[PDB]
Curated annotation (Swiss-Prot):
Binding annotation for substrate: T195, T196
Active site: H61 (proton donor/acceptor)
Gene that specifies this protein: CA2
Family per similarity comment: Belongs to the alpha-carbonic anhydrase family.
Note: Target of drugs used in treatments against glaucoma disorder and breast cancer.
Annotated organism of origin: Homo sapiens
Name of this protein: Carbonic anhydrase 2
Any one of the GO CC terms: plasma membrane
Phylogenetic lineage: Eukaryota, Metazoa, Chordata, Craniata, Vertebrata
Swiss-Prot/TrEMBL catalytic activity: hydrogencarbonate + H(+) = CO2 + H2O; urea = cyanamide + H2O
């Protein structure tokens, strides 16, 4: 099935998932001089003080940190959003080299990695119903550049040895995602999709302007994960990013001048 190799990567996905050539696919290049400042956009409200992390999973495409989303514990509101969106998981996309790895680009710049904090619109009752709706999800995207270490990321880095291969999971309680946020919540926003199959067009993307800095050693440890399962030939989990897709009839809005 689908992956990031030459025979099953992004250029092949449309054969099983024809929406790959759809009208609101993600990621996109953010042309900063074409995005319009929208003074009607509100500040983001990121309320993660009560977040309850549960588990970390290597799903063969990335590693996902999963949260308890059975109550309004960690929520995203405001910005372009109507209503309340509940945090369900986060994961990253990254490169084989520091020069690439992000999915979104900024004036064609590729960052070393990109963090996706995935939230679902509570009006639909659960995640499975939400992904069926054009306003079902809000994904907060945060760029990573290589520089100083991110202290709040280290607990993630240090558990990766225990989920090296596809299908492995580990307990991952009491992780505070506030330690992954930059100082500023200035953002760009546009309507898009999941960036892997099934590529559903159900996402309000909110991409922060300010990257976070992680150390070379931190991102090097991401690159030791495996796409394969245990007992299969080793294929390093690197370059698990989809390139920019056509913007088509969409406008990217900026929260900031
Ligand atoms: C607000 C809303 C609207 C529609 C059409 C819905 C739902 C909520 S729902 O609760 O997610 N389930 C469903 O099948 N259709
Ligand atoms: C809801 C969701 C599901 C999947 C598989 C996703 C994303 C969101 S995502 O945040 O668009 N990035 C990605 O690679 N896969
Ligand atoms: Zn993602």
């Amino acid at each position: 099935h689908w992956g990031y190799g030459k025979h099953n990567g992004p250029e092949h996905w449309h054969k099983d998932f024809p929406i790959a050539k759809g009208e609101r696919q993600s990621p996109v290049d953010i042309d900063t001089h074409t995005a319009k400042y929208d003074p009607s956009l509100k500040p983001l409200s990121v309320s993660y003080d009560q977040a309850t992390s549960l588990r970390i999973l290597n799903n063969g495409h990335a590693f996902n940190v999963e949260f308890d989303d059975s109550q309004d514990k960690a929520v995203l509101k405001g910005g372009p959003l109507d209503g309340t969106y509940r945090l369900i998981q986060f994961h990253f996309h990254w490169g084989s080299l520091d020069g690439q790895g992000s999915e979104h680009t900024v004036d064609k710049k590729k960052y070393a990695a990109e963090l996706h904090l995935v939230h679902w619109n509570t009006k639909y009752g659960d995640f499975g119903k939400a992904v069926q709706q054009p306003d079902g999800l809000a994904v907060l995207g945060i760029f990573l550049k290589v520089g100083s270490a991110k202290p709040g990321l280290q607990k993630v880095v240090d558990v990766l040895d225990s989920i090296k291969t596809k299908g492995k999971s580990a307990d991952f309680t009491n992780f505070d995602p506030r330690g992954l946020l930059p100082e500023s919540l200035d953002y760009w926003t546009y309507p898009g999709s999941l960036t892997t199959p099934p590529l559903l067009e159900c996402v309000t993307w909110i991409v922060l302007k300010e990257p976070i800095s992680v150390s070379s050693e931190q991102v090097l440890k991401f690159r030791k994960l495996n796409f394969n399962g245990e007992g299969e030939p080793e294929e390093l989990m690197v370059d698990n990013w989809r390139p920019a897709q056509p913007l088509k009839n969409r406008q990217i809005k900026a929260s900031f001048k």
